[PDB]
Amino acid sequence: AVKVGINGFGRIGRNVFRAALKNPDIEVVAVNDTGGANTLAHLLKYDSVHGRLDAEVSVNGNNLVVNGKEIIVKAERDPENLAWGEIGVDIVVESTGRFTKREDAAKHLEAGAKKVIISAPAKNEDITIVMGVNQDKYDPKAHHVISNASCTTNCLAPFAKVLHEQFGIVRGMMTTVHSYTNDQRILDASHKDLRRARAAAESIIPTTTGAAKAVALVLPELKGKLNGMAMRVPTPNVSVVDLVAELEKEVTVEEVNAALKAAAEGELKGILAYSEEPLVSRDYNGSTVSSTIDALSTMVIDGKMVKVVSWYDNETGYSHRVVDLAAYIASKGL
Amino acid sequence: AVKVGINGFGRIGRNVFRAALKNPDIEVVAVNDTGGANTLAHLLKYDSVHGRLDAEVSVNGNNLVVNGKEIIVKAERDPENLAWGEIGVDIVVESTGRFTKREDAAKHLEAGAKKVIISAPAKNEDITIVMGVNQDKYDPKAHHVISNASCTTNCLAPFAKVLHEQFGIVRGMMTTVHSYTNDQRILDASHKDLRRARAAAESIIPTTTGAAKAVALVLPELKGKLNGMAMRVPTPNVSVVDLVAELEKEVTVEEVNAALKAAAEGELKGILAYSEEPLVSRDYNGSTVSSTIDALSTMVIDGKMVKVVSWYDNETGYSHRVVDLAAYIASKGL
Amino acid sequence: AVKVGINGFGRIGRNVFRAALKNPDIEVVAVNDTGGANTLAHLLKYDSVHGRLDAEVSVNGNNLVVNGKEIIVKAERDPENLAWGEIGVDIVVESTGRFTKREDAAKHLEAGAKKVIISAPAKNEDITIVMGVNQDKYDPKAHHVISNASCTTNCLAPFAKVLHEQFGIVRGMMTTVHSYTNDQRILDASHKDLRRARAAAESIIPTTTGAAKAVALVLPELKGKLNGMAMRVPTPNVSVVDLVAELEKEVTVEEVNAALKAAAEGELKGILAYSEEPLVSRDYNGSTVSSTIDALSTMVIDGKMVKVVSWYDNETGYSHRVVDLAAYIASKGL
Amino acid sequence: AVKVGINGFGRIGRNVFRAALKNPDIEVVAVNDTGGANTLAHLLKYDSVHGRLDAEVSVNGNNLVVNGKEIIVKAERDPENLAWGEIGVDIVVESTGRFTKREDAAKHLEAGAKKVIISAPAKNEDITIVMGVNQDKYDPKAHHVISNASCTTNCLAPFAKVLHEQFGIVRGMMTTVHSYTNDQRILDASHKDLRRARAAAESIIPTTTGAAKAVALVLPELKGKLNGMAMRVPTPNVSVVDLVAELEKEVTVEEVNAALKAAAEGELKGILAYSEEPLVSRDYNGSTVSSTIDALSTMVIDGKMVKVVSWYDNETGYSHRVVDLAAYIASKGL
Ligand SMILES: NC(=O)C1=CN([C@@H]2O[C@H](COP(=O)(O)OP(=O)(O)OC[C@H]3O[C@@H](n4cnc5c(N)ncnc54)[C@H](OP(=O)(O)O)[C@@H]3O)[C@@H](O)[C@H]2O)C=CC1
Ligand SMILES: NC(=O)C1=CN([C@@H]2O[C@H](COP(=O)(O)OP(=O)(O)OC[C@H]3O[C@@H](n4cnc5c(N)ncnc54)[C@H](OP(=O)(O)O)[C@@H]3O)[C@@H](O)[C@H]2O)C=CC1
Ligand SMILES: NC(=O)C1=CN([C@@H]2O[C@H](COP(=O)(O)OP(=O)(O)OC[C@H]3O[C@@H](n4cnc5c(N)ncnc54)[C@H](OP(=O)(O)O)[C@@H]3O)[C@@H](O)[C@H]2O)C=CC1
Ligand SMILES: NC(=O)C1=CN([C@@H]2O[C@H](COP(=O)(O)OP(=O)(O)OC[C@H]3O[C@@H](n4cnc5c(N)ncnc54)[C@H](OP(=O)(O)O)[C@@H]3O)[C@@H](O)[C@H]2O)C=CC1
């Protein structure tokens, strides 16, 4: 029903496409990227991390043909020239990573789209939404340039919410042991971050993250109470958040796990999950949820300090949330 | 001067051997391992993580010959038949990973040695020492079977001591993002630990660690105040400790780093180092200290919760501490 | 239909089980391994390379339950005590890697089995079969202990057959760039083979292979004509054969390629596959065929020397051939 | 003595700098790159593959200071604006990877340099040289735009020569199992080569190479007799050439290796090396020669077809040859 257009057919752009495939509410009608149709068709079909796409993919001229439907392919470096209006694209997924500033993303609205979903933290956006945490604050009349936050914020917020409501967070530190991404280097080379300039697959690479702070965007009561960092490691996909927090209430591992398990089966079902199996990162490659609690890792010291570990497929979970967001927006009245 | 014998010529045994070459006080005279002299010579000469041994290594009979010195090579699976006393071996480094209980390690003293140093946490040891933290509690009469603790406790204890003495630690939790060891599997295979049963170079593997509890063995004032877990990752060597602690005094990042820098330059010189460079794990490969503070990572929320990150070459740093301990015991009288 | 028992639930045993799931003719009813049921079930369900087993798996007592069926789990290191017959096991899949000598594998026959299939090269086996090559020489009276050869031989044989019948192989060399296996080491440690004693995920490790010579067992005409080596690399699965050969006839890439494609859709369908896509190893992870010609790599020099490259998932292609052999044998008579 | 300028301070540029340090005849006086002095200084001091630079390095304003010597750092994207003459640079090392066509490479000559060395196969260059093979064909009044060929060609050529002179190469095929380079992608991304568009550390990626045919540039006699391909694998540095050749003479493995060993100690000493140790890739990391025969791998079928395997540090051995070429050209008169 809702016609979607994707700007930047990269790791997130292609996985949003895959995610959209199984959703009948949304419909991707066009993609824009710097690469050509044939190169794009090849990368959509064969994925080193998620396997082959089970859908027939072809190229008809300058367009992709997926399961008989023609997807238009544009090669506009400048968003302003996209003409989303002519093709009837309602919602645009901004996933180039170049246009997270409102002044850039809005160029899509001026080009013909009705809503823009920036797939990353943004600046001067109308609203940052984390599904399961605050999609209710979205106003169809007021918000048009929306941010879906980072994969890490989507992983942390859902459970920081439950921890906050049930016991109360005084302050907390977090660390995400995260898989490497296309922002890193294969072998030592210039990068604006001297840590990310180092061979990605060869080391544990500490780097900064704003995901901790961003939680305040969706959970205002936590402003100034959380901070953290990231450690990029030699894995191609899937990451894990490690949150150590000072609680207001005295608690037990049993109480904490039970609270998390409850949310995962109730209110946050589909966003937050709960596991008691001794699994590893590879086991989570492909999970569509935003945050899966690794229940076995939960610990408490002095009844007030806690450690909660949650898994997340940074490409898949996130891409599913983008599609869910799109579908939610469409339903609230486009 | 003091003759040493190494039991278990593996990753730690060979690196202890490499460390001893640069120490005039200790003298390695014999090694015991299940492998044959030729295999052991090859593995000592060429190392995938540390490169070529800068010394002449050859085989004479079924004995090793290093830089002209003949090293007796034994092959007794039962420590009771090593006859250390006959060849004048006073100190034995127990690094097979199988004789960590005082009862077993003690078989070396029966074979004639005067002291045994277990290169790992032990059960029932006379004392557990972390050089720079509690070596002064070593008693020549009462302590024969000593544990050098884990590579992780050796990294944590030195700065936890500083944080404690300077600001007071109320409680803290740690996570070590650690390189894989010979205790894991290349491909999925039977293992006591179902996390460690999974392909080491393919996932982030949360695993348990007693390393945070063990700090209380060397710093009793911290008994019951710390806890933590581990995460094994696809790197062959070098690990990092991530410590989050609730302090008593309100501090700033500058105060925390200044204290750390001062100790690295003072009392803990040689054991605790300090760095303000944006480096990655591969850069600490070969580091001989026990803990190198990543100053650029220090963080603080609410003036009371601090985050400190420290690097450690789990093989080289620990192996150097073993040699330092052997040298310190010898100087106390054997 | 035909009852099968698996000896050694390792990578090949668990993948033979998985492949067994979609074949109506055979039925796995018992497994024997060094590990416990809970461990065996965990590793059967979660696989770091192939993913979650899409089947309900659980432990009932000392037994496994997989989609309602209860699989008998035993722990006998001595195959003579397995009592295959009491439980009706017709065919035994010997995949421990320890009993490759006929005298050893024959213990299962002493135990009540009727046929044994060694999942690797053997010594004094009654016959070595490569499905699609010489399975027609199996004689239910004459052969009881059969070898399914190596993953490499199953990859090389099918296309070396075609090439030989078509143009005449005068002589040729092969090199298999193979993923690492459980036979290698994570970090430097003792090994019969000093190349394989080195950290598996850190290097390109040259090693021997009898795969080229073993082709003579299934194709006598090629006796004394082929030879080769292996190079183990940092991937956990999927390998490729690189064959360079001198033909008797003068050929063109087109001809060589047409010959191979023709066979893939003809006689060798399901065993030999043909590809004109520019794919990479991870794309073949999960392929059930034995050999997939990488058509774009075929080269010819002087119209007489050819180069052919074929991919193979060493775990899946092989485990499927094992299941096929079991099914073929049974159809021939037990 | 001779003043050198490096255009493109990447993997090859920094390693050419390092090698240059060890040569008294050459003096690197300037570097041109897209990154700033601080970034460049950091990347030169810390290498993920080669370790810390054994030198005193600092940034004096906008220049590098290495052991007292100041290195002018420029940020020109267009070589025409480089002004090499202004600073006295006689030889320019073109290592950006973007100016291999004579039209671009010569812009250096126009900007004032006297000679240009292209660190890769070139187009319309005056001469392609492989040290130890045809450096003597260098004509100082004619040859101003020189290509040092590729790392692969530098590995193959030296031994292709010896085999030819001694037994006569009728024809041969080569495969290079090569480490990934900065030309590949960390994760699936657009690339003109759909093979190299795939996650570099996750697969065995077959790709093309012109290194076999390029041997004809330096050993004209072998024009039309060789061809081959490459396989990029998940290792950061060090590669191996696998050559299968049809010889004119009847040979034995001993005959083959004896020829190679002699050459390594004779004419090609310093370029070609010989090894009878069972080593692996990491062992060759840091090797300065261009090719090292893995003697244990030499194989022969029918006394006419040989297989020779040679290791090569693609970054170090090559950079040394670049510096050797610069020192040689200069000796002839600039
Ligand atoms: N990967 C992950 O785990 C997650 C990433 N994100 C965010 O998603 C965004 C994309 O990241 P990711 O998909 O990983 O990165 P990629 O590099 O894989 O993808 C970005 C795609 O956009 C293309 N592109 C760049 N500029 C243009 C342009 N001007 N017009 C059209 N297309 C263009 C790129 O091509 P090219 O660069 O080759 O020119 C590339 O194909 C980033 O902002 C990232 O922070 C959010 C959650 C998770
Ligand atoms: N790896 C690291 O970073 C650290 C490890 N340690 C500890 O040090 C110990 C060794 O670890 P690591 O070196 O990594 O392991 P390795 O497996 O590399 O070394 C252990 C060695 O002991 C040999 N061995 C086993 N049993 C005997 C025996 N009964 N008699 C003689 N030799 C024997 C083993 O041979 P084989 O395998 O053939 O049985 C192997 O060669 C463990 O306690 C570990 O926890 C401490 C700090 C760091
Ligand atoms: N992996 C591949 O690519 C291929 C391997 N093969 C062959 O299959 C055999 C196994 O290969 P792979 O699966 O990779 O090896 P694994 O190590 O994964 O599997 C071997 C299994 O046998 C078990 N085992 C060993 N001894 C006994 C015993 N005495 N009694 C009961 N169970 C035992 C092992 O348990 P434990 O470790 O606890 O002792 C292990 O789980 C080898 O011969 C190999 O060459 C053939 C084709 C392909
Ligand atoms: N790596 C190896 O094993 C070998 C490589 N070579 C060849 O050497 C060349 C360099 O390769 P390599 O060092 O591997 O690759 P790198 O990408 O690491 O090096 C290229 C360097 O040149 C810089 N650069 C790019 N464009 C310009 C420009 N317009 N002006 C100034 N500087 C520029 C790059 O900056 P930036 O990162 O911002 O684009 C980078 O620092 C290639 O031709 C390659 O084929 C030859 C033998 C071996």
Short mmCIF file of C-alpha atoms and ligand atoms in Angstrom, two decimals, chain B residues 188-190, chain C residues 7-14 32-35 76-78 95-100 119-121 149-151 178 181-182 237 314-315 318, ligand 3:
data_model
loop_
_atom_site.label_atom_id
_atom_site.label_comp_id
_atom_site.label_asym_id
_atom_site.label_seq_id
_atom_site.Cartn_x
_atom_site.Cartn_y
_atom_site.Cartn_z
CA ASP B 188 31.83 -26.41 17.23
CA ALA B 189 32.78 -29.34 19.46
CA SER B 190 32.11 -30.93 22.86
CA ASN C 7 29.61 -43.13 15.35
CA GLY C 8 31.08 -39.78 16.35
CA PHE C 9 28.68 -36.83 16.43
CA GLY C 10 31.22 -34.28 15.20
CA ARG C 11 30.98 -31.85 12.34
CA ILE C 12 30.36 -34.60 9.75
CA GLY C 13 28.22 -36.75 12.07
CA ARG C 14 25.88 -33.86 12.96
CA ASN C 32 27.52 -42.69 19.80
CA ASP C 33 29.94 -39.99 20.95
CA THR C 34 32.23 -39.00 23.78
CA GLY C 35 29.79 -36.23 24.75
CA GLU C 76 31.29 -46.35 24.05
CA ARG C 77 34.83 -45.53 22.96
CA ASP C 78 35.24 -49.16 21.91
CA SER C 95 32.84 -40.65 11.49
CA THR C 96 35.07 -40.49 14.59
CA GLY C 97 38.22 -40.24 12.48
CA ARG C 98 39.81 -42.96 14.64
CA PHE C 99 38.64 -46.18 13.00
CA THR C 100 39.72 -45.83 9.35
CA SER C 119 33.43 -41.01 6.26
CA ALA C 120 37.05 -40.55 5.10
CA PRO C 121 39.90 -42.31 3.28
CA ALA C 149 36.64 -41.00 0.30
CA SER C 150 37.48 -37.42 1.20
CA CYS C 151 35.54 -34.22 0.58
CA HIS C 178 40.50 -25.53 2.07
CA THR C 181 38.89 -28.23 10.27
CA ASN C 182 38.83 -29.62 13.79
CA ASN C 237 33.82 -23.96 5.76
CA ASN C 314 33.19 -29.80 2.60
CA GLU C 315 30.59 -30.38 5.32
CA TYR C 318 29.98 -34.66 1.81
N1 LIG E 3 35.06 -31.79 8.37
C1 LIG E 3 35.23 -32.07 7.08
O1 LIG E 3 35.35 -31.20 6.21
C2 LIG E 3 35.35 -33.57 6.73
C3 LIG E 3 35.86 -34.52 7.63
N2 LIG E 3 35.92 -35.88 7.25
C4 LIG E 3 36.31 -36.94 8.21
O2 LIG E 3 35.30 -37.28 9.23
C5 LIG E 3 35.99 -37.62 10.45
C6 LIG E 3 35.49 -36.65 11.48
O3 LIG E 3 35.58 -35.35 10.89
P1 LIG E 3 35.03 -34.11 11.72
O4 LIG E 3 33.57 -34.31 11.94
O5 LIG E 3 35.52 -32.91 10.99
O6 LIG E 3 35.66 -34.29 13.16
P2 LIG E 3 35.10 -33.91 14.57
O7 LIG E 3 36.16 -33.74 15.56
O8 LIG E 3 34.13 -32.80 14.41
O9 LIG E 3 34.18 -35.20 14.89
C7 LIG E 3 34.71 -36.40 15.44
C8 LIG E 3 33.79 -36.85 16.56
O10 LIG E 3 34.08 -38.20 16.94
C9 LIG E 3 34.03 -38.24 18.35
N3 LIG E 3 34.84 -39.36 18.82
C10 LIG E 3 36.16 -39.50 18.75
N4 LIG E 3 36.56 -40.65 19.28
C11 LIG E 3 35.44 -41.20 19.68
C12 LIG E 3 35.35 -42.47 20.20
N5 LIG E 3 36.40 -43.24 20.36
N6 LIG E 3 34.11 -42.88 20.49
C13 LIG E 3 33.05 -42.10 20.27
N7 LIG E 3 33.13 -40.90 19.70
C14 LIG E 3 34.34 -40.43 19.39
C15 LIG E 3 34.66 -36.96 18.74
O11 LIG E 3 34.46 -36.64 20.11
P3 LIG E 3 35.73 -36.02 20.93
O12 LIG E 3 36.37 -34.89 20.20
O13 LIG E 3 35.08 -35.55 22.35
O14 LIG E 3 36.88 -37.10 21.30
C16 LIG E 3 34.01 -35.99 17.78
O15 LIG E 3 32.82 -35.41 18.33
C17 LIG E 3 37.48 -37.40 10.18
O16 LIG E 3 37.99 -38.62 9.69
C18 LIG E 3 37.55 -36.50 8.95
O17 LIG E 3 38.75 -36.60 8.17
C19 LIG E 3 35.48 -36.29 5.99
C20 LIG E 3 34.97 -35.34 5.12
C21 LIG E 3 34.91 -33.99 5.48
#
